[PDB]
């Protein structure tokens, strides 16, 4: 079996798994909508009670399965629970990363296309907030193919489509070279580049002074607390969902990556380091860039408006408009979209590896054929997201939101209840440079599952292109269940 070459490459590849588009696009809008500075209270609680424990559990399950030649949850769940229904539940560990990859790689291709257009200065150039934002709203809509009327259909530009092809080619170019010579070698270059880009952008944003406000006014707006809405269960659901997404928990990606860690290698300190690096990039770097620069340029009055506009409006419309209004801002735009691209790329290769690992481990396919077939399924399926509006939202909800929380509870129960709390605890701490604090044993066994279960219950008591997407992703689950059937025989 393939293995990571170095401990540094392992940590940077896992950090690249976590540090993605959610750090810079999702997190700022999540915090602004769910209490501002007060959002850190449920965010930190979810990080300590759910994020950290589930991270170590997924590292352990992956390495445990990897020692027996299995990198994906259908086989690994069966190894932990000799029951056919454990294999069916394990299919979610392939379905979730595949469905998420379908729309994640498309958004990733947007950042590459915007990086290209901004590097060469093929950007619009406009006084008034709406007068400055309109040319960039139309720039994104022409790139995406937004309808002029009520039609719910998208028609991407030829440039966007070709850039999506290039994006798939780049993901294949990394993934086809394997774990050490592909993912690990690219992580050692991309992650240092990522942090340098982000730190530089934070510094440049903290120097913004406009007639409407300063960077300090933007930081004040973002971290303005609103502790009253901590009574809203939706804030706690948003915080837990953000923790799942930003740490790549419940996507089967950590498990597959950890399956290439040697049996006796540390996973306690490595996983803690990767999770810590992500939180630094998320709350320190991701939070400091987009929203503060937006408030600094459009003032606090317009800040509430663009905060409610959404992550895509903020990342692909509002921030580009700001850039075009500063000296050398087209290059700042390039660095922004270059940052997002490497952040997305290091995450998309992680979210496509589970399907590659399943084809290699269980169907005995070569790496070349496993990578090319995985890319083909993702490329084809992405035409749903490319041409159908609201298709991405449905996939992100079922797979990247509800699915990951249900799967996080499932892998927890299988590993720590059915397999054995004492056995799982021994499996986590084995080989660890540091040991897990004893209090987390009771957190994993009682607190985390009770927290997730109550959230599930509280979550349940709170067009027709949607049925097209539902139909398709249901078929994907049927397809993957058939491949698991074929792997048995
Ligand atoms: C699906 C995951 C790869 C998402 C990634 N952890 C992010 O924060 O963007
Ligand atoms: Na993240
Ligand atoms: Na990433």
Q: What is the DSSP string of 205-243?
A: HTT-EETTEEHHHHHHHHT-B-GGGGG-HHHHHHHHHHH
Question: Positive or negative, the Cα torsion across 253, 254, 257, 263?
Answer: negative
The answer to whether residue 1 is domain-embedded is no
Indicate which ligand has the atom closest to the C-alpha of 14: 3
Ligand 1 pocket check for 248: Cβ under 6 Å: yes
Q: What is the Cα–Cα distance from 70 to 473, expressed in whole angstroms?
A: 25
Q: Is 455 domain-assigned?
A: yes
Between CA 69 and CA 181 the distance in angstroms is: 20
Give the integer Cα–Cα distance in Å for 367 and 357: 9
Cα atoms in the 13 Å half-sphere on the side-chain side of 59:
34
The total domain count for the chain is: 1
DSSP state of 188: H
Give the distance (Å) from ligand 2 centre to CA of residue 110. 18
Structure determined via: X-ray
> Cα(194) to centroid of ligand 3, in Å?
9
Cα separation, 334 vs 416, in Å, equals 46
Contact 365, 107 (CB under 8 A): no
Cα–Cα nearest to 268, from 54, 47, 48, 432: 432
Range of the domain at 377: 7-488
Has residue 2 been placed in a domain? no
Beta bridge partners of 214: 209
Residue 118 near residue 379 (C-beta atoms within 8 A): no
351 CB near ligand 1 (under 6 Å): yes
* Residue 350 domain flag: yes
Residue with tokens 């698991």: 484
Phi, psi of 286 (to 5 degrees): -60, -40
CATH number of 105's domain: 1.10.4160
Q: Which residues define the annotated binding site for phosphocholine?
A: 84
Nearest-CA neighbor of 225 among 43, 40, 23?
A: 40
Ligand 1 neighbour 100 (Cβ under 6 A): yes
CA of 129 to the centre of ligand 1 (A): 32
How many angstroms separate the alpha carbon of residue 282 from the centre of ligand 2?
A: 7
Pocket probe mutation, ligand 1, options 15, 22, 47, max atoms within 8 Å of Cβ = 22
**DSSP states of 240-274:** HHHHHHHTTTTSSHHHHHHTTS-TTS--HHHHHHH
Q: What are phi and psi of 42, to 5 degrees?
A: -65, -30
- The rounded distance, in Å, linking the Cα atoms of 447 and 457 is 15
| Residues with Cβ within 8 Å of residue 179, at least 6 apart in sequence | 2, 3, 4, 260
Residue 302: other Cβ atoms inside 10 A: 18
Identify the residue whose C-alpha is closest to ligand 1 atom 8.
Answer: 246
């Amino acid at each position: 079996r393939e293995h990571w070459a170095t401990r540094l490459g392992l940590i940077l590849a896992m950090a690249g798994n976590a540090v993605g588009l959610g750090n810079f696009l999702r997190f700022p809008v999540q915090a602004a909508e769910n209490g501002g500075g007060a959002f850190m209270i449920p965010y930190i609680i979810a990080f300590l009670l759910v994020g950290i424990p589930l991270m170590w559990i997924e590292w352990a399950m992956g390495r445990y399965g990897g020692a027996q030649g299995h990198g994906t949850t259908p086989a690994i769940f069966y190894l932990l629970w000799r029951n056919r229904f454990a294999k069916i539940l394990g299919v979610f560990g392939l379905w979730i990363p595949l469905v998420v990859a379908i729309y994640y790689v498309y958004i990733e291709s947007w950042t590459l296309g915007f990086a290209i257009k901004f590097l060469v200065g093929l950007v619009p150039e406009p006084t008034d907030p709406d007068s400055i934002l309109r040319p960039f709203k139309e720039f994104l809509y022409s790139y995406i193919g937004v309808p002029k009327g009520d039609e719910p259909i998208l028609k991407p530009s030829l440039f966007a489509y070709i850039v999506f092809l290039i994006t798939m080619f780049i993901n294949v170019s990394i993934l086809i070279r394997g774990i050490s010579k592909g993912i690990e070698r690219f992580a050692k270059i991309a992650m240092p580049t990522l942090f340098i880009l982000a730190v530089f952008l934070v510094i440049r944003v903290f120097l913004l002074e406009t007639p409407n406000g300063t960077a300090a006014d933007g930081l004040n707006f973002l971290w303005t607390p609103d502790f009253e809405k901590l009574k809203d269960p939706g804030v706690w659901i948003a915080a837990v969902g953000q923790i799942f997404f930003t740490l790549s928990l419940g996507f089967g990606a950590i498990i597959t990556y950890a399956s290439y860690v040697r049996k006796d290698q540390d996973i306690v300190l490595s996983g803690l380091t990767a999770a810590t690096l992500n939180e630094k990039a998320e709350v320190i770097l991701g939070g400091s860039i987009s929203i503060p620069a937006a408030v600094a340029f459009f003032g606090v009055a317009n800040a509430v408006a663009i905060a409610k506009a959404g992550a895509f409006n903020l990342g692909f419309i509002t921030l580009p408009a700001i850039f075009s209004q500063t000296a050398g801002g087209t290059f700042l735009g390039f660095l922004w979209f270059f940052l997002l691209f490497f952040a997305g790329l290091t995450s998309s290769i992680a979210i496509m590896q589970p399907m590659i690992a399943f084809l290699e481990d269980e169907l005995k396919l070569s790496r070349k054929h496993a990578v090319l077939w995985t890319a083909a399924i993702v490329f084809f399926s992405a035409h749903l997201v490319m041409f159908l509006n609201k298709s991405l939202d449905e996939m992100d909800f079922w797979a990247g939101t509800i699915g990951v929380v249900f799967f996080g509870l499932t892998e927890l129960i299988i590993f720590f209840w059915i397999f054995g709390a004492d056995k799982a605890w021994e499996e986590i701490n084995r080989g660890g440079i540091i040991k897990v604090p004893r209090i987390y044993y009771y957190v994993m066994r009682y607190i985390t599952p009770a927290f997730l279960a109550v959230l599930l219950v509280v979550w349940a008591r709170e067009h027709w292109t949607v049925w097209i997407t539902r139909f398709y992703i249901i078929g994907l689950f049927l397809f993957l269940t058939f491949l698991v059937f074929l792997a048995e025989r």
